[PDB]
Subunit: 270 residues, 3 copies
Amino acid sequence: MFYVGTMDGWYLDTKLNSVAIGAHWSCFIVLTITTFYLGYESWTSRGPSKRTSFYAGYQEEQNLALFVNFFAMLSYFGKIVADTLGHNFGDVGPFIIGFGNYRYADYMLTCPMLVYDLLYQLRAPYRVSCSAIIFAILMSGVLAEFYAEGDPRLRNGAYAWYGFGCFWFIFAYSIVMSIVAKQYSRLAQLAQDTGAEHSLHVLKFAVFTFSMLWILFPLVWAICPRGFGWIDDNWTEVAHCVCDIVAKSCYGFALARFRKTYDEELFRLL
Amino acid sequence: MFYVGTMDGWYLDTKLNSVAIGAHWSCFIVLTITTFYLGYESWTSRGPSKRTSFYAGYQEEQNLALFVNFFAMLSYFGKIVADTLGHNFGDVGPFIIGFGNYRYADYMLTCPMLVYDLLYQLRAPYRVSCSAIIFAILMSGVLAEFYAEGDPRLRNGAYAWYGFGCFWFIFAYSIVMSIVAKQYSRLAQLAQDTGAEHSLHVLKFAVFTFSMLWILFPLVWAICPRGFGWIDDNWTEVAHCVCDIVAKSCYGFALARFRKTYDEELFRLL
Amino acid sequence: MFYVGTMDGWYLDTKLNSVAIGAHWSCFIVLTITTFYLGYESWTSRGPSKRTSFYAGYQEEQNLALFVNFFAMLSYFGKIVADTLGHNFGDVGPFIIGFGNYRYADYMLTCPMLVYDLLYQLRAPYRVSCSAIIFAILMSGVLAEFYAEGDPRLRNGAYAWYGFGCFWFIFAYSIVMSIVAKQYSRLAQLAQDTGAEHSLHVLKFAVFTFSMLWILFPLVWAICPRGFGWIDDNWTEVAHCVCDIVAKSCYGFALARFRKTYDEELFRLL
Ligand SMILES: CC(C)CCC[C@@H](C)[C@H]1CC[C@H]2[C@@H]3CC=C4C[C@@H](O)CC[C@]4(C)[C@H]3CC[C@]12C
Ligand SMILES: CC(C)CCC[C@@H](C)[C@H]1CC[C@H]2[C@@H]3CC=C4C[C@@H](O)CC[C@]4(C)[C@H]3CC[C@]12C
Ligand SMILES: CC(C)CCC[C@@H](C)[C@H]1CC[C@H]2[C@@H]3CC=C4C[C@@H](O)CC[C@]4(C)[C@H]3CC[C@]12C
Ligand SMILES: CC(C)CCC[C@@H](C)[C@H]1CC[C@H]2[C@@H]3CC=C4C[C@@H](O)CC[C@]4(C)[C@H]3CC[C@]12C
Ligand SMILES: CC(C)CCC[C@@H](C)[C@H]1CC[C@H]2[C@@H]3CC=C4C[C@@H](O)CC[C@]4(C)[C@H]3CC[C@]12C
Ligand SMILES: CC(C)CCC[C@@H](C)[C@H]1CC[C@H]2[C@@H]3CC=C4C[C@@H](O)CC[C@]4(C)[C@H]3CC[C@]12C
Ligand SMILES: *C/C=C(C)/C=C/C=C(C)/C=C/C1=C(C)CCCC1(C)C
Ligand SMILES: *C/C=C(C)/C=C/C=C(C)/C=C/C1=C(C)CCCC1(C)C
Ligand SMILES: *C/C=C(C)/C=C/C=C(C)/C=C/C1=C(C)CCCC1(C)C
Ligand SMILES: CCCCCCCCCCCCCCCC(=O)O
Ligand SMILES: CCCCCCCCCCCCCCCC(=O)O
Ligand SMILES: CCCCCCCCCCCCCCCC(=O)O
Ligand SMILES: CCCCCCCCCCCCCCCC(=O)O
Ligand SMILES: CCCCCCCCCCCCCCCC(=O)O
Ligand SMILES: CCCCCCCCCCCCCCCC(=O)O
């Protein structure tokens, strides 16, 4: 009778329309392109010096954007296999971290890597600590799905867990931004008028812009059928596809361009 | 008919009484307090020198006690949401590492971090190796729950897995204590009568005391309905709450006090 | 009606014969022996210098073969407990990473460690990156099991996921071998005729031989009931036991012998 968390739910027909299926295809294609591009950048990178063969091979923190895009691509491969077979893939079948049959179970793998990577660009403190908190926020979102989709007697568990996640998200942000802020401040005074100043401006704004676009995820939760229900389940899939293209692919391309142009300029100051 | 491992089990009414629910509330409050306290110590720590701003931010091994308390707090948040909704949370619903709807599934995340942290205080060898073995012991305990709570035809699987876990636990201990012993021995001769001797005495006894209190977990298993059944399921929840307050919170406060008083005294010798 | 992914499947009688049960016993005994042997080598190792007490304790990358054998031993302990109780253990019960009730769910823990260890022997670049890709390939194999064993309407999902895994496996190999190749090339010119040359020859061939034996896993998939069905489920269990003895135990013994004889000879060049 309740399908969430079961194999019975997995064998049902897909509830998704052409709009949601099209969004999954679009997201998979963009993530696959980004993965091959970031793979090429990883192979050919010689570092800021431009004299170290397989630089990204020895400094493997450089491959974090590649692995974010690669794991997101694997998750969307699963969504398009399920869509083309025409079976239900929403919060049914086996619970596997890094796989997106459970909403936010894919992000539990990729988001901690993405926050680590963002903070690593500014050599910011609390990188592992912010990855751990993001892991717990995404766990909160997974548990809110089980309550939201289960027996309506337990529905208020979804708000308890959303609230917990939002609490720690606001906390994490209000500490993260106060690190990104101090890291730019340190380097800004250090940079003086050297020309590294302009690249350092760009790095702070890019890292801040991509950080702040993460607020779209709890906002989509609030407007979708989990909260107010102003958008349906099909448009929620479209909202997540767009947010994933921005958070992972556009981030991946933006960072890859920064490393192409401004890496050495800041490698002396960072 | 058998509920362990199923969503059907999750929708049943809670089997817990007021004593077990009160123990969960008490444990959640203490873990939340410890988390905020250890968060404050992490933010304000300047290291043993007292001259490094955001020391714990760059030396993130210092945040391990914080993350143990934070993940235990998340697990107990889940128990009190389930208690207040009034649904069954004992070995039912989705299997998620770091979440305590399966007994020992929460500990699979926090215990390896806690053993790493203990051995890191003495700069002991085999820190990752001891974290790996503790992970396997807690896996053993998870698998013993599935056999203990399932079809009684398979009940003897619970003893096979408890035995496996106990075997490797005795092994791990009988090697760990022989490291803690040699690490104190090395530093004891090195310390001479310098005043660092007294702090080093305290560190060995504290690390040994907290290590030895981990024997309470397999002893609670033996006395609870899994073994002899001298205590019921409600008193087992109380026993785990008390053991968690000692193993995580009291450990967290004890370590934080050691770092406040004796960090620099031993940072020259460690 | 479909048992894959369910607790109902776990309570069924074993489908395995004496040949498959004997293979599980044989594999468990060999992995346990290898674990105790590699444990002894870890304890007594003094490094290439032969002057560092608990060398493997401080350089914990040396314990990777030990932890591969230890986790494989835990997985086979589970198979023999299930065989002796006489219950079904094939892709039923709880999904737990590092546990082999789901085919390839045990390997998701051990294979990334094993590829890290192989590449670490040659100080090869892309070690974490190759561990991440192997993790995704083994995830692909897990998802192909759910489709292969479920509702036959969704059977073609098994080929989609096998294809995805094979694609990234060929990719990973065709990049890995081009690293092992360049790492041997670098050291070969560096070694000249010093006597380190002969040991370096042995290391390249051993690492290449063990790397290439990993092709047996997707080949067994193709010949077993997942693909052409030339062998039955019982002989598939035997094929995996033999492949595990070679990939983990024989690897473990071969590496341990290399470190006994040729460690110092190459520690100056590596
Ligand atoms: C989406 C499916 C069909 C996979 C196709 C991936 C395509 C788009 C990938 C694979 C190889 C890639 C190319 C690899 C190398 C280079 C050289 C350099 O100048 C950067 C871009 C460029 C030219 C890449 C563009 C994207 C690319 C063409
Ligand atoms: C990047 C673009 C160009 C290529 C698309 C790649 C993937 C997503 C495509 C290519 C071929 C596809 C498969 C083609 C055939 C079948 C059989 C059908 O009964 C179920 C769907 C299934 C199993 C498809 C799933 C999706 C699939 C694996
Ligand atoms: C349990 C629920 C209600 C959450 C409440 C957490 C409370 C207990 C936390 C939040 C902020 C914390 C304080 C933060 C900072 C300091 C300064 C220093 O002198 C150590 C203790 C002290 C004074 C902390 C004591 C505990 C504290 C008051
Ligand atoms: C630390 C102390 C002071 C604060 C306690 C925090 C948490 C555990 C409390 C505060 C408010 C609580 C919620 C209040 C309202 C409801 C609706 C009810 O139908 C189910 C329980 C549920 C969902 C509660 C779960 C537990 C809860 C989230
Ligand atoms: C498979 C079950 C019964 C467990 C038994 C494990 C046995 C085979 C293990 C445990 C202790 C091990 C021994 C430990 C130490 C040494 C000394 C050295 O010269 C290497 C081999 C040798 C002699 C080992 C051989 C294997 C050994 C005997
Ligand atoms: C290495 C060799 C020498 C020792 C073998 C170790 C393990 C695999 C053996 C030793 C004793 C065995 C147990 C003996 C008794 C029972 C009770 C029976 O109703 C179910 C099987 C079960 C639970 C067995 C499972 C496997 C077991 C745990
Ligand atoms: C690649 C995907 C990214 C970067 C996703 C990030 C998602 C979040 C920050 C989600 C956060 C949420 C909360 C703050 C509350 C609980 C619900 C979530 C999971 C949507
Ligand atoms: C914060 C919680 C802690 C430190 C818990 C530690 C738990 C253990 C060491 C449990 C060990 C067990 C065995 C030795 C055998 C199997 C049963 C267990 C899991 C209770
Ligand atoms: C100890 C076990 C080892 C080293 C196992 C390795 C297994 C693989 C490389 C398996 C690979 C597969 C694919 C290439 C495609 C999908 C099916 C798999 C999982 C068999
Ligand atoms: C340390 C944790 C801090 C507290 C964070 C969680 C607090 C928010 C709980 C929200 C519960 C909302 C329940 C709504 C009930 C209703 O619909 O009437
Ligand atoms: C932390 C980022 C910002 C998140 C903004 C949260 C705004 C509150 C959303 C609550 C939605 C759940 C309650 C809706 C219930 C209903 O009216 O049906
Ligand atoms: C390397 C592994 C070492 C062995 C560790 C496990 C051995 C203990 C097995 C205990 C089985 C107890 C079964 C009791 C059967 C009964 O009740 O009659
Ligand atoms: C390794 C730490 C010490 C653990 C102490 C173990 C003591 C044996 C407990 C076995 C309990 C299981 C058998 C009870 C069966 C019964 O009598 O009903
Ligand atoms: C980036 C991903 C690359 C593509 C890798 C997967 C492509 C192989 C898909 C195989 C599908 C085979 C379906 C067979 C259908 C049938 O039986 O008729
Ligand atoms: C990447 C390593 C090599 C793998 C070799 C793959 C060979 C193709 C195997 C496809 C098997 C699945 C299709 C069989 C369908 C059938 O005929 O019943």
